[PDB]
Ligand SMILES: CC(C)CCC[C@@H](C)[C@H]1CC[C@H]2[C@@H]3CC=C4C[C@@H](O)CC[C@]4(C)[C@H]3CC[C@]12C
Ligand SMILES: CC(C)CCC[C@@H](C)[C@H]1CC[C@H]2[C@@H]3CC=C4C[C@@H](O)CC[C@]4(C)[C@H]3CC[C@]12C
Protein backbone atom coordinates (compact mmCIF):
# COMPACT_ATOMS: atom_id res chain seq x y z
CA UNK A 382 0.00 0.00 0.00
CA UNK A 383 1.25 3.59 -0.62
CA UNK A 384 3.41 4.68 2.36
CA UNK A 385 1.77 8.14 2.31
CA UNK A 386 -1.54 6.55 3.44
CA UNK A 387 -0.39 4.96 6.72
CA UNK A 388 1.94 7.91 7.30
CA UNK A 389 -1.08 10.26 6.85
CA UNK A 390 -2.97 8.64 9.79
CA UNK A 391 0.16 8.68 12.02
CA UNK A 392 0.87 12.39 11.08
CA UNK A 393 -2.70 13.55 11.63
CA UNK A 394 -2.84 11.88 15.07
CA UNK A 395 0.56 13.39 15.98
CA UNK A 396 -0.66 16.87 14.98
CA UNK A 397 -3.88 16.47 17.02
CA UNK A 398 -1.78 15.42 20.08
CA UNK A 399 0.59 18.40 19.51
CA UNK A 400 -2.37 20.83 19.58
CA UNK A 401 -3.80 19.38 22.82
CA UNK A 402 -0.36 19.18 24.47
CA UNK A 403 0.27 22.89 23.79
CA UNK A 404 -3.25 24.05 24.74
CA UNK A 405 -3.54 22.20 28.07
CA UNK A 406 0.01 22.87 29.23
CA UNK A 407 -0.12 26.62 28.33
CA UNK A 408 -3.34 26.64 30.51
CA UNK A 409 -1.34 25.05 33.40
CA UNK A 410 1.42 27.73 33.08
CA UNK A 411 -1.25 30.50 32.80
CA UNK A 412 -3.00 29.25 36.00
CA UNK A 413 0.24 29.27 38.00
CA UNK A 414 1.29 32.73 36.71
CA UNK A 415 -2.13 34.31 37.54
CA UNK A 416 -3.05 32.64 40.86
CA UNK A 417 -0.85 33.23 43.97
CA UNK A 418 -2.48 30.27 45.80
CA UNK A 419 -0.85 28.09 43.05
CA UNK A 420 2.60 29.79 43.46
CA UNK A 421 4.58 27.39 45.58
CA UNK A 422 7.70 25.21 45.10
CA UNK A 423 5.76 22.06 44.14
CA UNK A 424 4.05 24.00 41.34
CA UNK A 425 7.36 25.45 39.98
CA UNK A 426 8.30 21.78 39.13
CA UNK A 427 4.74 21.36 37.74
CA UNK A 428 5.44 24.34 35.40
CA UNK A 429 8.85 22.88 34.41
CA UNK A 430 6.95 19.64 33.53
CA UNK A 431 4.32 21.61 31.55
CA UNK A 432 7.16 23.45 29.65
CA UNK A 433 8.65 20.06 28.64
CA UNK A 434 5.14 19.02 27.42
CA UNK A 435 4.66 22.26 25.44
CA UNK A 436 8.04 21.56 23.75
CA UNK A 437 6.89 17.99 22.90
CA UNK A 438 4.05 19.68 20.90
CA UNK A 439 6.14 22.47 19.38
CA UNK A 440 9.35 20.54 18.63
CA UNK A 441 9.41 16.79 19.45
CA UNK A 442 6.23 15.97 17.47
CA UNK A 443 7.31 17.94 14.28
CA UNK A 444 10.73 16.21 14.67
CA UNK A 445 9.08 12.73 14.98
CA UNK A 446 6.94 13.48 11.84
CA UNK A 447 10.13 14.58 10.01
CA UNK A 448 12.06 11.44 11.01
CA UNK A 449 9.16 9.21 9.93
CA UNK A 450 9.85 10.36 6.29
CA UNK A 451 13.40 8.97 6.27
CA UNK A 452 14.53 12.20 4.50
CA UNK A 453 18.20 12.65 3.46
CA UNK A 454 20.15 14.56 6.15
CA UNK A 455 23.64 15.18 7.54
CA UNK A 456 24.00 12.38 10.12
CA UNK A 457 24.61 14.70 13.10
CA UNK A 458 21.62 16.88 12.17
CA UNK A 459 19.49 13.72 11.99
CA UNK A 460 20.86 12.74 15.40
CA UNK A 461 19.73 16.07 16.96
CA UNK A 462 16.13 15.77 15.70
CA UNK A 463 16.09 12.10 16.85
CA UNK A 464 17.49 12.84 20.36
CA UNK A 465 15.69 16.09 21.29
CA UNK A 466 12.63 14.19 22.64
CA UNK A 467 15.03 12.29 25.04
CA UNK A 468 15.98 15.70 26.55
CA UNK A 469 12.28 16.46 27.19
CA UNK A 470 11.54 13.01 28.61
CA UNK A 471 14.62 13.33 30.89
CA UNK A 472 13.53 16.76 32.11
CA UNK A 473 10.06 15.29 32.84
CA UNK A 474 11.67 12.51 34.94
CA UNK A 475 13.74 15.06 36.96
CA UNK A 476 10.56 17.19 37.51
CA UNK A 477 8.55 14.08 38.65
CA UNK A 478 11.34 13.02 41.05
CA UNK A 479 11.57 16.56 42.48
CA UNK A 480 7.77 16.68 43.06
CA UNK A 481 7.93 13.30 44.93
CA UNK A 482 10.86 14.48 47.10
CA UNK A 483 9.11 17.82 47.76
CA UNK A 484 5.98 15.96 49.00
CA UNK A 485 8.13 13.64 51.15
CA UNK A 486 9.89 16.61 52.85
CA UNK A 487 6.48 18.24 53.48
CA UNK A 488 5.08 15.17 55.32
CA UNK A 489 8.27 13.94 57.04
CA UNK A 490 9.52 17.36 58.26
CA UNK A 491 6.72 19.98 58.04
CA UNK A 492 8.35 22.28 60.65
CA UNK A 493 11.57 22.42 58.54
CA UNK A 494 9.86 22.40 55.06
CA UNK A 495 9.51 26.21 54.54
CA UNK A 496 13.12 26.93 55.55
CA UNK A 497 14.54 24.05 53.47
CA UNK A 498 12.48 24.20 50.28
CA UNK A 499 12.38 27.75 48.86
CA UNK A 500 11.48 29.21 45.45
CA UNK A 501 15.11 30.29 44.97
CA UNK A 502 16.53 26.80 45.65
CA UNK A 503 13.73 25.28 43.45
CA UNK A 504 14.60 27.56 40.46
CA UNK A 505 18.28 26.57 40.76
CA UNK A 506 17.40 22.86 40.83
CA UNK A 507 15.15 23.27 37.76
CA UNK A 508 17.95 25.06 35.83
CA UNK A 509 20.48 22.30 36.80
CA UNK A 510 17.98 19.62 35.84
CA UNK A 511 17.42 21.17 32.36
CA UNK A 512 21.22 21.27 31.79
CA UNK A 513 21.55 17.61 32.89
CA UNK A 514 18.57 16.63 30.66
CA UNK A 515 20.36 18.15 27.62
CA UNK A 516 23.62 16.32 28.57
CA UNK A 517 21.81 12.93 28.98
CA UNK A 518 19.41 13.22 25.99
CA UNK A 519 22.12 14.53 23.62
CA UNK A 520 24.86 12.08 24.79
CA UNK A 521 24.70 10.42 21.28
CA UNK A 522 25.85 13.80 19.79
CA UNK A 523 29.02 13.36 21.96
CA UNK A 524 29.99 10.31 19.79
CA UNK A 525 27.81 7.47 21.02
CA UNK A 526 26.09 7.18 17.67
CA UNK A 527 26.02 5.18 14.40
CA UNK A 528 27.23 8.11 12.17
CA UNK A 529 30.62 6.36 11.78
CA UNK A 530 28.84 3.37 10.17
CA UNK A 531 26.25 4.83 7.77
CA UNK A 532 23.86 2.65 5.76
CA UNK A 533 25.30 3.74 2.41
CA UNK A 534 23.04 1.46 0.36
CA UNK A 535 19.91 3.00 1.86
CA UNK A 536 21.46 6.50 1.43
CA UNK A 537 22.26 5.81 -2.30
CA UNK A 538 18.83 4.23 -2.94
CA UNK A 539 17.22 7.48 -1.67
CA UNK A 540 19.55 9.72 -3.69
CA UNK A 541 21.26 11.16 -0.56
CA UNK A 542 24.42 13.25 -0.95
CA UNK A 543 27.89 12.86 0.57
CA UNK A 544 27.90 12.86 4.35
CA UNK A 545 24.11 12.29 4.30
CA UNK A 546 22.06 9.32 5.51
CA UNK A 547 18.36 8.39 5.33
CA UNK A 548 17.25 9.94 8.63
CA UNK A 549 15.74 7.17 10.71
CA UNK A 550 15.85 7.05 14.54
CA UNK A 551 17.09 3.47 14.80
CA UNK A 552 19.71 4.00 12.07
CA UNK A 553 21.51 6.82 13.95
CA UNK A 554 20.73 6.29 17.66
CA UNK A 555 22.52 3.15 19.03
CA UNK A 556 20.20 0.61 20.67
CA UNK A 557 22.76 -0.15 23.47
CA UNK A 558 22.46 3.59 24.40
CA UNK A 559 18.64 3.38 24.22
CA UNK A 560 18.40 0.30 26.42
CA UNK A 561 21.27 0.48 28.91
CA UNK A 562 21.81 4.21 29.26
CA UNK A 563 18.55 5.88 28.43
CA UNK A 564 16.09 3.20 29.61
CA UNK A 565 17.74 1.30 32.48
CA UNK A 566 19.94 4.02 33.97
CA UNK A 567 18.13 7.25 33.13
CA UNK A 568 14.45 6.23 33.16
CA UNK A 569 13.88 2.97 35.10
CA UNK A 570 16.19 3.77 38.02
CA UNK A 571 14.61 7.25 38.71
CA UNK A 572 11.08 5.78 38.28
CA UNK A 573 11.96 3.03 40.84
CA UNK A 574 13.41 5.70 43.18
CA UNK A 575 10.09 7.67 42.76
CA UNK A 576 8.13 4.50 43.68
CA UNK A 577 10.34 4.21 46.82
CA UNK A 578 9.71 7.87 47.70
CA UNK A 579 5.90 7.48 47.28
CA UNK A 580 5.91 4.30 49.46
CA UNK A 581 7.70 6.31 52.18
CA UNK A 582 5.18 9.20 51.82
CA UNK A 583 2.16 6.89 52.25
CA UNK A 584 3.82 4.99 55.14
CA UNK A 585 4.62 8.33 56.88
CA UNK A 586 1.03 9.57 56.47
CA UNK A 587 -0.38 6.22 57.70
CA UNK A 588 1.89 6.27 60.79
CA UNK A 589 1.12 9.93 61.58
CA UNK A 590 -2.67 9.40 61.27
CA UNK A 591 -2.35 6.31 63.55
CA UNK A 592 -0.30 8.35 66.06
CA UNK A 593 -3.01 11.09 66.20
CA UNK A 594 -5.73 8.48 66.88
CA UNK A 595 -3.56 6.66 69.45
CA UNK A 596 -2.85 9.87 71.45
CA UNK A 597 -6.57 10.73 71.42
CA UNK A 598 -7.52 7.20 72.59
CA UNK A 599 -4.81 7.30 75.29
CA UNK A 600 -6.25 10.57 76.67
CA UNK A 601 -9.75 9.03 76.87
CA UNK A 602 -8.51 5.73 78.38
CA UNK A 603 -6.48 7.56 81.05
CA UNK A 604 -9.50 9.73 81.95
CA UNK A 605 -11.46 6.48 82.62
CA UNK A 606 -8.50 5.00 84.63
CA UNK A 607 -8.69 8.14 86.87
CA UNK A 608 -12.54 7.95 87.24
CA UNK A 609 -12.33 4.32 88.41
CA UNK A 610 -9.12 4.78 90.48
CA UNK A 611 -9.19 3.41 94.02
CA UNK A 612 -6.38 5.60 95.49
CA UNK A 613 -4.27 8.78 94.93
CA UNK A 614 -1.29 6.76 93.62
CA UNK A 615 -3.39 5.35 90.75
CA UNK A 616 -4.65 8.84 89.82
CA UNK A 617 -0.99 10.06 89.96
CA UNK A 618 0.23 7.22 87.69
CA UNK A 619 -2.41 7.94 85.02
CA UNK A 620 -1.81 11.72 85.23
CA UNK A 621 2.01 11.43 84.89
CA UNK A 622 1.48 9.61 81.55
CA UNK A 623 -1.13 12.18 80.45
CA UNK A 624 1.32 15.04 81.11
CA UNK A 625 4.10 13.40 79.04
CA UNK A 626 1.68 12.66 76.14
CA UNK A 627 0.33 16.26 76.20
CA UNK A 628 3.88 17.77 76.07
CA UNK A 629 4.84 15.38 73.23
CA UNK A 630 1.80 16.49 71.18
CA UNK A 631 2.42 20.22 71.96
CA UNK A 632 -6.51 28.78 70.18
CA UNK A 633 -4.70 25.43 69.85
CA UNK A 634 -1.71 26.74 71.85
CA UNK A 635 -4.17 28.06 74.50
CA UNK A 636 -5.87 24.64 74.61
CA UNK A 637 -2.62 22.75 75.19
CA UNK A 638 -1.59 25.34 77.86
CA UNK A 639 -4.92 24.73 79.64
CA UNK A 640 -4.55 20.91 79.27
CA UNK A 641 -1.04 20.70 80.75
CA UNK A 642 -2.02 23.14 83.51
CA UNK A 643 -5.12 21.12 84.43
CA UNK A 644 -3.13 17.85 84.49
CA UNK A 645 -0.60 19.69 86.76
CA UNK A 646 -3.40 20.84 89.15
CA UNK A 647 -4.77 17.26 89.36
CA UNK A 648 -1.24 15.84 89.89
CA UNK A 649 -0.55 18.27 92.75
CA UNK A 650 -3.81 17.15 94.46
CA UNK A 651 -2.95 13.46 93.83
CA UNK A 652 0.52 14.00 95.42
CA UNK A 653 -1.16 15.46 98.56
CA UNK A 654 -3.36 12.31 98.89
CA UNK A 655 -6.57 14.12 97.90
CA UNK A 656 -8.11 11.46 95.64
CA UNK A 657 -11.64 12.93 95.37
CA UNK A 658 -10.38 16.45 94.65
CA UNK A 659 -7.85 15.07 92.07
CA UNK A 660 -10.64 13.10 90.35
CA UNK A 661 -12.89 16.21 90.22
CA UNK A 662 -9.94 18.26 88.84
CA UNK A 663 -9.30 15.58 86.17
CA UNK A 664 -12.97 15.82 85.07
CA UNK A 665 -12.33 19.45 84.01
CA UNK A 666 -9.99 18.02 81.30
CA UNK A 667 -13.20 16.96 79.45
CA UNK A 668 -14.21 20.59 78.90
CA UNK A 669 -10.75 21.34 77.42
CA UNK A 670 -10.85 18.17 75.29
CA UNK A 671 -14.28 19.13 73.90
CA UNK A 672 -13.51 22.81 73.25
CA UNK A 673 -9.86 22.59 72.08
CA UNK A 674 -8.16 19.15 71.73
CA UNK A 675 -10.93 17.63 69.55
CA UNK A 676 -10.68 20.60 67.14
CA UNK A 677 -6.87 20.18 67.00
CA UNK A 678 -7.22 16.43 66.24
CA UNK A 679 -9.81 17.08 63.47
CA UNK A 680 -7.64 19.76 61.86
CA UNK A 681 -4.43 17.64 62.04
CA UNK A 682 -6.29 14.65 60.53
CA UNK A 683 -7.78 16.85 57.76
CA UNK A 684 -4.30 18.28 56.96
CA UNK A 685 -2.83 14.76 56.68
CA UNK A 686 -5.77 13.62 54.48
CA UNK A 687 -5.17 16.56 52.07
CA UNK A 688 -1.46 15.61 51.88
CA UNK A 689 -2.41 11.96 51.08
CA UNK A 690 -4.84 13.23 48.38
CA UNK A 691 -2.10 15.50 46.94
CA UNK A 692 0.55 12.75 46.98
CA UNK A 693 -1.93 10.41 45.21
CA UNK A 694 -2.47 13.06 42.47
CA UNK A 695 1.31 13.45 42.08
CA UNK A 696 1.82 9.58 42.02
CA UNK A 697 -0.88 9.20 39.33
CA UNK A 698 1.08 11.62 37.03
CA UNK A 699 4.36 9.74 37.65
CA UNK A 700 2.56 6.40 37.00
CA UNK A 701 0.90 7.72 33.81
CA UNK A 702 4.36 8.86 32.57
CA UNK A 703 5.62 5.27 33.16
CA UNK A 704 2.53 3.74 31.48
CA UNK A 705 2.85 5.96 28.34
CA UNK A 706 6.63 5.54 27.84
CA UNK A 707 7.18 1.90 28.88
CA UNK A 708 5.78 0.36 25.65
CA UNK A 709 8.35 2.13 23.42
CA UNK A 710 11.23 1.25 25.83
CA UNK A 711 10.02 -2.39 25.99
CA UNK A 712 9.89 -2.56 22.16
CA UNK A 713 13.50 -1.26 22.17
CA UNK A 714 14.44 -4.08 24.59
CA UNK A 715 12.94 -6.69 22.15
CA UNK A 716 14.76 -5.15 19.15
CA UNK A 717 18.04 -5.12 21.12
CA UNK A 718 17.99 -8.36 23.15
CA UNK A 719 16.20 -10.52 20.55
CA UNK A 720 17.96 -10.23 17.14
CA UNK A 721 16.24 -13.54 16.15
CA UNK A 722 12.77 -11.94 16.72
CA UNK A 723 11.21 -10.03 13.80
CA UNK A 724 11.25 -6.23 14.52
CA UNK A 725 7.94 -4.83 16.00
CA UNK A 726 5.87 -3.79 12.91
CA UNK A 727 5.72 -0.15 11.75
CA UNK A 728 2.07 0.25 12.85
CA UNK A 729 3.09 -0.82 16.40
CA UNK A 730 6.04 1.62 16.41
CA UNK A 731 3.65 4.43 15.39
CA UNK A 732 1.20 3.40 18.18
CA UNK A 733 3.97 3.32 20.85
CA UNK A 734 5.28 6.72 19.68
CA UNK A 735 1.80 8.27 19.75
CA UNK A 736 1.12 6.76 23.21
CA UNK A 737 4.38 8.25 24.55
CA UNK A 738 3.33 11.68 23.10
CA UNK A 739 -0.17 11.41 24.61
CA UNK A 740 1.55 11.66 28.05
CA UNK A 741 2.07 15.36 27.18
CA UNK A 742 -1.71 15.85 27.02
CA UNK A 743 -2.82 14.09 30.27
CA UNK A 744 -1.40 16.17 33.24
CA UNK A 745 -3.81 19.19 32.78
CA UNK A 746 -6.70 16.69 33.11
CA UNK A 747 -5.36 15.14 36.30
CA UNK A 748 -4.90 18.64 37.80
CA UNK A 749 -8.45 19.66 36.76
CA UNK A 750 -10.06 16.49 38.16
CA UNK A 751 -8.08 16.24 41.40
CA UNK A 752 -6.92 19.75 42.41
CA UNK A 753 -9.66 22.26 43.26
CA UNK A 754 -7.34 25.31 43.06
CA UNK A 755 -6.31 24.40 39.45
CA UNK A 756 -9.90 23.44 38.52
CA UNK A 757 -11.28 26.85 39.69
CA UNK A 758 -8.46 28.82 38.01
CA UNK A 759 -8.94 26.95 34.69
CA UNK A 760 -12.70 27.75 34.90
CA UNK A 761 -11.89 31.46 35.53
CA UNK A 762 -9.37 31.67 32.61
CA UNK A 763 -11.70 29.92 30.14
CA UNK A 764 -14.68 32.10 31.26
CA UNK A 765 -12.87 35.48 31.25
C1 LIG B 1 14.05 27.79 19.18
C2 LIG B 1 13.52 26.81 18.14
C3 LIG B 1 12.15 27.25 17.64
C4 LIG B 1 14.51 26.63 16.98
C5 LIG B 1 14.42 25.29 16.29
C6 LIG B 1 15.56 25.01 15.32
C7 LIG B 1 15.49 23.64 14.63
C8 LIG B 1 14.19 23.51 13.84
C9 LIG B 1 16.76 23.36 13.79
C10 LIG B 1 18.06 23.47 14.64
C11 LIG B 1 19.07 22.45 14.07
C12 LIG B 1 18.44 22.04 12.75
C13 LIG B 1 18.97 20.81 12.01
C14 LIG B 1 20.48 20.97 11.76
C15 LIG B 1 20.99 20.14 10.62
C16 LIG B 1 20.24 19.40 9.82
C17 LIG B 1 20.90 18.52 8.79
C18 LIG B 1 20.36 18.79 7.40
O1 LIG B 1 20.96 17.87 6.47
C19 LIG B 1 18.86 18.63 7.38
C20 LIG B 1 18.17 19.56 8.40
C21 LIG B 1 18.71 19.42 9.85
C22 LIG B 1 18.21 18.08 10.44
C23 LIG B 1 18.20 20.64 10.67
C24 LIG B 1 16.67 20.63 10.87
C25 LIG B 1 16.19 21.85 11.69
C26 LIG B 1 16.92 22.00 13.04
C27 LIG B 1 16.55 20.84 13.98
C1 LIG C 1 3.56 -0.88 29.78
C2 LIG C 1 2.42 -1.89 29.70
C3 LIG C 1 1.20 -1.26 29.05
C4 LIG C 1 2.86 -3.16 28.96
C5 LIG C 1 3.24 -2.99 27.50
C6 LIG C 1 3.71 -4.28 26.88
C7 LIG C 1 3.94 -4.25 25.36
C8 LIG C 1 4.88 -3.10 25.01
C9 LIG C 1 4.45 -5.62 24.87
C10 LIG C 1 3.48 -6.80 25.20
C11 LIG C 1 3.67 -7.87 24.12
C12 LIG C 1 4.91 -7.41 23.36
C13 LIG C 1 5.22 -7.99 21.98
C14 LIG C 1 5.32 -9.51 22.04
C15 LIG C 1 5.94 -10.10 20.81
C16 LIG C 1 6.61 -9.41 19.89
C17 LIG C 1 7.17 -10.11 18.67
C18 LIG C 1 8.60 -9.72 18.37
O1 LIG C 1 8.98 -10.27 17.10
C19 LIG C 1 8.73 -8.21 18.30
C20 LIG C 1 8.26 -7.55 19.59
C21 LIG C 1 6.80 -7.90 19.96
C22 LIG C 1 5.83 -7.27 18.94
C23 LIG C 1 6.52 -7.38 21.41
C24 LIG C 1 6.59 -5.85 21.52
C25 LIG C 1 6.20 -5.34 22.92
C26 LIG C 1 4.83 -5.86 23.37
C27 LIG C 1 3.71 -5.32 22.45
Ligand SMILES: CC(C)CCC[C@@H](C)[C@H]1CC[C@H]2[C@@H]3CC=C4C[C@@H](O)CC[C@]4(C)[C@H]3CC[C@]12C
Pocket residue numbers: 569707711714715718719
Ligand atom coordinates in the same frame (compact mmCIF):
# COMPACT_ATOMS: atom_id res chain seq x y z
C1 LIG D 1 9.11 -2.74 36.55
C2 LIG D 1 9.11 -2.98 35.04
C3 LIG D 1 8.19 -1.99 34.35
C4 LIG D 1 10.51 -2.92 34.47
C5 LIG D 1 10.63 -3.17 32.98
C6 LIG D 1 10.72 -4.63 32.62
C7 LIG D 1 11.45 -4.92 31.29
C8 LIG D 1 12.92 -4.51 31.41
C9 LIG D 1 11.26 -6.39 30.85
C10 LIG D 1 9.77 -6.83 30.80
C11 LIG D 1 9.67 -7.97 29.77
C12 LIG D 1 11.12 -8.23 29.35
C13 LIG D 1 11.41 -8.93 28.02
C14 LIG D 1 10.68 -10.27 27.92
C15 LIG D 1 11.18 -11.12 26.80
C16 LIG D 1 12.30 -10.90 26.12
C17 LIG D 1 12.67 -11.78 24.94
C18 LIG D 1 14.09 -12.32 25.04
O1 LIG D 1 14.46 -12.98 23.83
C19 LIG D 1 15.06 -11.20 25.28
C20 LIG D 1 14.70 -10.39 26.54
C21 LIG D 1 13.28 -9.78 26.47
C22 LIG D 1 13.23 -8.73 25.33
C23 LIG D 1 12.94 -9.15 27.85
C24 LIG D 1 13.76 -7.87 28.13
C25 LIG D 1 13.34 -7.13 29.41
C26 LIG D 1 11.82 -6.86 29.47
C27 LIG D 1 11.39 -5.88 28.36
Ligand SMILES: Nc1nc(-c2cccc(-n3ccnc3)n2)nc(-c2ccco2)n1
Pocket residue numbers: 444445446448449450463466467470550551559709710713730734
Ligand atom coordinates in the same frame (compact mmCIF):
# COMPACT_ATOMS: atom_id res chain seq x y z
N1 LIG E 1 12.80 3.04 18.59
C1 LIG E 1 12.47 4.27 18.98
N2 LIG E 1 12.04 5.13 18.02
C2 LIG E 1 11.78 6.37 18.45
C3 LIG E 1 11.30 7.36 17.44
C4 LIG E 1 11.22 8.71 17.74
C5 LIG E 1 10.68 9.57 16.80
C6 LIG E 1 10.24 9.08 15.59
C7 LIG E 1 10.37 7.74 15.37
N3 LIG E 1 9.88 7.13 14.18
C8 LIG E 1 9.14 7.76 13.20
C9 LIG E 1 8.86 6.81 12.29
N4 LIG E 1 9.36 5.60 12.67
C10 LIG E 1 9.98 5.82 13.81
N5 LIG E 1 10.87 6.88 16.26
N6 LIG E 1 11.86 6.76 19.73
C11 LIG E 1 12.27 5.84 20.62
C12 LIG E 1 12.36 6.23 22.03
C13 LIG E 1 12.36 7.43 22.65
C14 LIG E 1 12.44 7.19 24.05
C15 LIG E 1 12.48 5.82 24.19
O1 LIG E 1 12.45 5.23 22.96
N7 LIG E 1 12.59 4.58 20.30
Ligand SMILES: CCCCCCCC/C=C/CCCCCCCC(=O)O
Pocket residue numbers: 425426428429432500501503504507511
Ligand atom coordinates in the same frame (compact mmCIF):
# COMPACT_ATOMS: atom_id res chain seq x y z
C1 LIG F 1 15.38 24.17 23.14
C2 LIG F 1 14.50 25.17 23.85
C3 LIG F 1 14.86 25.40 25.30
C4 LIG F 1 14.71 24.21 26.21
C5 LIG F 1 14.77 24.54 27.68
C6 LIG F 1 13.56 25.29 28.20
C7 LIG F 1 13.42 25.30 29.71
C8 LIG F 1 12.19 26.01 30.21
C9 LIG F 1 11.97 25.91 31.68
C10 LIG F 1 11.01 26.50 32.34
C11 LIG F 1 10.52 26.12 33.71
C12 LIG F 1 10.33 27.27 34.65
C13 LIG F 1 9.52 26.89 35.89
C14 LIG F 1 9.39 27.98 36.92
C15 LIG F 1 10.68 28.27 37.64
C16 LIG F 1 10.52 28.85 39.03
C17 LIG F 1 10.04 30.27 39.02
C18 LIG F 1 10.47 31.04 40.26
O1 LIG F 1 10.27 30.52 41.37
O2 LIG F 1 11.01 32.15 40.10
Ligand SMILES: CCCCCCCC/C=C/CCCCCCCC(=O)O
Pocket residue numbers: 457515519522
Ligand atom coordinates in the same frame (compact mmCIF):
# COMPACT_ATOMS: atom_id res chain seq x y z
C1 LIG G 1 18.64 27.04 25.70
C2 LIG G 1 18.66 26.50 24.28
C3 LIG G 1 19.43 25.22 24.12
C4 LIG G 1 19.58 24.78 22.69
C5 LIG G 1 20.30 23.46 22.50
C6 LIG G 1 21.70 23.43 23.08
C7 LIG G 1 22.51 22.22 22.68
C8 LIG G 1 22.71 22.07 21.21
C9 LIG G 1 23.58 20.91 20.83
C10 LIG G 1 24.66 20.97 20.10
C11 LIG G 1 25.53 19.83 19.66
C12 LIG G 1 26.47 20.22 18.56
C13 LIG G 1 27.02 19.06 17.74
C14 LIG G 1 27.70 19.48 16.47
C15 LIG G 1 28.05 18.34 15.54
C16 LIG G 1 28.66 18.78 14.22
C17 LIG G 1 28.98 17.62 13.31
C18 LIG G 1 30.27 16.88 13.60
O1 LIG G 1 30.97 17.24 14.57
O2 LIG G 1 30.58 15.94 12.84
Ligand SMILES: CCCCCCCC/C=C\CCCCCCCC(=O)O
Pocket residue numbers: 438439440443444446447450452
Ligand atom coordinates in the same frame (compact mmCIF):
# COMPACT_ATOMS: atom_id res chain seq x y z
C1 LIG H 1 3.88 26.46 16.47
C2 LIG H 1 5.14 26.06 15.75
C3 LIG H 1 5.47 24.59 15.87
C4 LIG H 1 4.72 23.64 14.96
C5 LIG H 1 5.26 23.56 13.55
C6 LIG H 1 4.62 22.51 12.68
C7 LIG H 1 5.35 22.26 11.37
C8 LIG H 1 4.74 21.24 10.46
C9 LIG H 1 4.82 19.83 10.97
C10 LIG H 1 5.66 18.90 10.58
C11 LIG H 1 7.12 19.09 10.31
C12 LIG H 1 7.49 19.16 8.86
C13 LIG H 1 7.87 17.83 8.23
C14 LIG H 1 8.80 17.95 7.04
C15 LIG H 1 9.15 16.62 6.41
C16 LIG H 1 10.16 16.70 5.27
C17 LIG H 1 10.09 15.47 4.40
C18 LIG H 1 11.12 15.37 3.28
O1 LIG H 1 11.97 16.28 3.18
O2 LIG H 1 11.06 14.38 2.51
Ligand code: NA
Pocket residue numbers: 430433434469470473740741
Ligand atom coordinates in the same frame (compact mmCIF):
# COMPACT_ATOMS: atom_id res chain seq x y z
NA1 NA I 1 6.39 14.97 29.98
